[PDB]
Ligand binder design. Structure first.
Ligand SMILES: O=C(O)c1ccc(OCc2c(-c3c(Cl)cccc3C(F)(F)F)noc2-c2cc[nH]c2)cc1F
Length: 242
């Protein structure tokens, strides 16, 4: 079923186009739009907890777009609800972190944040400099690959659809979706002469560890200073919030 695989590609890429938040062309064109030193100081002088509220709300929105991404993947809504939640709990923030590389400019080590590009020093008030450095470093590694939009879409589909996540109830059903996505990704890389990126993808455990550290810090902040969430997915919200 060759066209089936070429189908799944178009459908992962449609889901991705509909949920990617900002077009790559817009992110690239704005690269010259950089926060001034005056604007940087304004962010650095904000309360920890206001910077936390702003960042938490951008991240909640990013997670919701990833959930919509998964929901639009052919086969995902046919998984049982338990397995949908297991997969999204384990992988949605991993996908958010990967998606960040599109908004990262390796030339000056800046990220697109609230309308302009700024470096790590923008986030000083959060007092999380080690975690922020790890996020910038990771985006720097991914940015060297020059990910195309379909590569990010297919790669992040596989971040989510991982039959190894503990707690799955219909593991063979997740495996079938995983195998088809893997074939789609590998067929696409062969067609575009891009198989060389396979050896350059983040090693096993590196995205897991960064995401673990990230979510753990978000949980600490939410314990100290809870944000109000525009909750759209009750079964998933209930797994992350208490
Ligand atoms: O709309 C919803 O129903 C809905 C459900 C869950 C959700 O979870 C976000 C989330 C967060 C997070 C964020 Cl983004 C900001 C502040 C605090 C937290 C934390 F840590 F307290 F949970 N961290 O990890 C995840 C996650 C989700 C899937 N895997 C990981 C967000 C939603 F909008």
């Amino acid at each position: 079923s060759l066209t089936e695989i070429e189908h799944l590609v178009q459908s992962v890429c449609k889901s991705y186009r509909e949920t990617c938040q900002l077009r790559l062309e817009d992110l690239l064109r704005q690269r010259s739009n950089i926060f001034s030193r005056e604007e940087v100081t304004g962010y650095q002088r904000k309360s920890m907890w206001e910077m936390w509220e702003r960042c938490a709300h951008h991240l909640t929105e990013a997670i919701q777009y990833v959930v919509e991404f998964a929901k639009r993947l052919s086969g995902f809504m046919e998984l049982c609800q338990n397995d949908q939640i297991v997969l999204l709990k384990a992988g949605a923030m991993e996908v958010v972190l990967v998606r960040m590389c599109r908004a990262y400019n390796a030339d000056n080590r800046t990220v697109f944040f609230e309308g302009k590009y700024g470096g790590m020093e923008l986030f000083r008030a959060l007092g999380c400099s080690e975690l922020i450095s790890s996020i910038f470093d990771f985006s720097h590694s991914l940015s060297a690959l020059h990910f195309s939009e379909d590569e990010i879409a297919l790669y992040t589909a596989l971040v989510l659809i991982n039959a190894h996540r503990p707690g799955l109830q219909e593991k063979r059903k997740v495996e079938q979706l995983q195998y088809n996505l893997e074939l789609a990704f590998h067929h696409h890389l062969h067609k575009t002469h891009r198989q060389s990126i396979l050896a350059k993808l983040p090693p096993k455990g590196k995205l897991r560890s960064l995401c673990s550290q990230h979510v753990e810090r978000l949980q600490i902040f939410q314990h100290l200073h809870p944000i109000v969430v525009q909750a759209a997915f009750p079964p998933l919200y209930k797994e992350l919030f208490s």
